[PDB]
Amino acid sequence: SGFRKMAFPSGKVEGCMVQVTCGTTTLNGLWLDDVVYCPRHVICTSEDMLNPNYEDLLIRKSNHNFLVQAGNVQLRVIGHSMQNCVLKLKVDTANPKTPKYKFVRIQPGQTFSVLACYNGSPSGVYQCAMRPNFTIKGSFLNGSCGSVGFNIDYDCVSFCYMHHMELPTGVHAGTDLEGNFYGPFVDRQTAQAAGTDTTITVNVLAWLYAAVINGDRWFLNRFTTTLNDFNLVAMKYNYEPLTQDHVDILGPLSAQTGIAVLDMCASLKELLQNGMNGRTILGSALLEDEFTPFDVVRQCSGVTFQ
Amino acid sequence: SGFRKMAFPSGKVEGCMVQVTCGTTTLNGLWLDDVVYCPRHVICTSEDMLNPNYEDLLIRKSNHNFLVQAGNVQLRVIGHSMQNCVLKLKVDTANPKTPKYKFVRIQPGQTFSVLACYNGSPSGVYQCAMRPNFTIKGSFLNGSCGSVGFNIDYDCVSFCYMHHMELPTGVHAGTDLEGNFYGPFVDRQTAQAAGTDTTITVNVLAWLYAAVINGDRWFLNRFTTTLNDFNLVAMKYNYEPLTQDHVDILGPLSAQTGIAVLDMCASLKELLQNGMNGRTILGSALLEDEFTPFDVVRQCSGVTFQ
Numbered sequence A, B: 001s002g003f004r005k006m007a008f009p010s011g012k013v014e015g016c017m018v019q020v021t022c023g024t025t026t027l028n029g030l031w032l033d034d035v036v037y038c039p040r041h042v043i044c045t046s047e048d049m050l051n052p053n054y055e056d057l058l059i060r061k062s063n064h065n066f067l068v069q070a071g072n073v074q075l076r077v078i079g080h081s082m083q084n085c086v087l088k089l090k091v092d093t094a095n096p097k098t099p100k101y102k103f104v105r106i107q108p109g110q111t112f113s114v115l116a117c118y119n120g121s122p123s124g125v126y127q128c129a130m131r132p133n134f135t136i137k138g139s140f141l142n143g144s145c146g147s148v149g150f151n152i153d154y155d156c157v158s159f160c161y162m163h164h165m166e167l168p169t170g171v172h173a174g175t176d177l178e179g180n181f182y183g184p185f186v187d188r189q190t191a192q193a194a195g196t197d198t199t200i201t202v203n204v205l206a207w208l209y210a211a212v213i214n215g216d217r218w219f220l221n222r223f224t225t226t227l228n229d230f231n232l233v234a235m236k237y238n239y240e241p242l243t244q245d246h247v248d249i250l251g252p253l254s255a256q257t258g259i260a261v262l263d264m265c266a267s268l269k270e271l272l273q274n275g276m277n278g279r280t281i282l283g284s285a286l287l288e289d290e291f292t293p294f295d296v297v298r299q300c301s302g303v304t305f306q
């Protein structure tokens, strides 16, 4: 019983966090095997910022301009390269704590855990989603750049996010671990329009199923809807279109609860049109969209990690 | 920028989680040095449950009736004792991953991180508060007993909760790591009245300060209130009394924001009386009470852990 915004256990990632310094700029890096990955803007000066030429900036640097600190221990940089918006620092020592890992570029609507760090030291862990507009609503202060997002599957850490910047609305932008930004963003100080966000419909449906699994049925109704008629209402409320593939993905939850997907869509329609009239669902007065179908199955089923 | 329900990094605790089996009952234990701590009801049969005599039950057990598994490795139990509602299993091997630790019995209104585990393996981490009625609103399934709650301060893990049981409302009850229940609960299957819960006023105020720090002032007003007149309104809305000690604890946040505590109390009063009229605070449509003053300072300041 219960339902919480649950992060993955962070231990496998904590062992990979380091501090990278170049000049007066210090941020975090990710140490896997003998490579440290970090945002390339570590190489920039404040005045380099409106349109840095990173190729030009990096050619002017030497291995010895990079200081990497793992705990108390300085790691010697023996090589460096740039891949998209990430810098790869080859170091003299392979990380003995390297977990089994992969790099993944996630789709909008997928969730991940963030290990927020400062000066190479973990501060906290929380769950995020990749928004439809390719921002994340994180909690990041000065010094958190290079903090990473991840998912865990059995023993394998799948890294999917590295933090780079804050947008004027207070939301966050960054890259995959190959250095490609999510969204239209670039690592320069130029005005940058974040698209208008939308609500992740398939996730709202997943969380309504979680509410049912946990014993709460008050928002259910006797109605059904067609997919087409549901999507007409979704559009009006700034919800993402629901596809047949989303319907299929919700199959396991529909089967467990005995509530067909399009019957749950009729409940969501009624909630969008009527509100909650002072009632809550899983302790929220808003419809929650940062749980995927898999997140619900995981937490209502008790999957663990090796 | 941003504000999330943030847990502590769990790595130091993950290294301490083990599986304990006695008969047909399997749950989690906490392995520190050469001792494994777990709920004493691991020794019970289903039929032992309405009023077990645990002294009588334990005298009938031998070291070899306890199976402890750390990962793939079986640890030999070489001694056993009962302390209140926890069983202490002395094992042949000291845990090489034992962190610096303490055991703490927390006050109602304090928060902690839970590492939910199953069969000795961590599943996820989330933040909880000890409610005024000494329950927690966790996420726990069959097999999660023996999962622990904790706080971290520099390098020191302060354990404060071990999970034992679920109450009929879906909330959770358990003990400190010395085996004393929080609240009036006992580890038997007898009807057990959980008191009527209340909202943690000092924490709501802390979270309103967090909202201001993060740039949002819409709920502020020009009014002030006396403590006495605030508490008269608190009572009507089932909020805990605010004391002068709470006011003092909110000092740092009041100083950082330039908003006196009793001025923030006037904003909360107006929110209780008027509602939010369709507005949100830090992404919530409800007033959030599971952040302490210290949690806010930590997350709006970037404290890390050694």
Ligand SMILES: *[C@](O)(C(N)=O)[C@H](CC1CCC1)NC(=O)[C@@H]1[C@@H]2[C@H](CN1C(=O)[C@@H](NC(=O)NC(C)(C)C)C(C)(C)C)C2(C)C
Pocket (backbone or CB within 6 Å): A026, A027, A041, A049, A140, A141, A142, A143, A144, A145, A146, A164, A165, A166, A167, A168, A186, A187, A188, A189, A190, A191, A192
């Ligand atoms: C990280 O590098 C770090 N040291 O932790 C840093 C975190 C931010 C949070 C305060 C400092 N990231 C940057 O400084 C990043 C680098 C420049 C400027 N950056 C920003 O995040 C700025 N945002 C911004 O310029 N947004 C646009 C471009 C107007 C949309 C800040 C004003 C928040 C510093 C680059 C290379 C993008």
Ligand SMILES: *[C@](O)(C(N)=O)[C@H](CC1CCC1)NC(=O)[C@@H]1[C@@H]2[C@H](CN1C(=O)[C@@H](NC(=O)NC(C)(C)C)C(C)(C)C)C2(C)C
Pocket (backbone or CB within 6 Å): B026, B027, B041, B049, B140, B141, B142, B143, B144, B145, B146, B164, B165, B166, B167, B168, B186, B187, B188, B189, B190, B191, B192
């Ligand atoms: C843990 O032992 C475990 N194996 O993980 C287990 C978790 C619960 C969640 C389903 C099993 N805890 C117990 O089984 C615990 C033990 C008995 C019964 N327990 C309960 O939690 C029961 N609740 C209960 O009896 N509540 C009262 C007493 C009516 C208020 C369940 C009905 C949830 C099993 C004891 C010793 C309390």
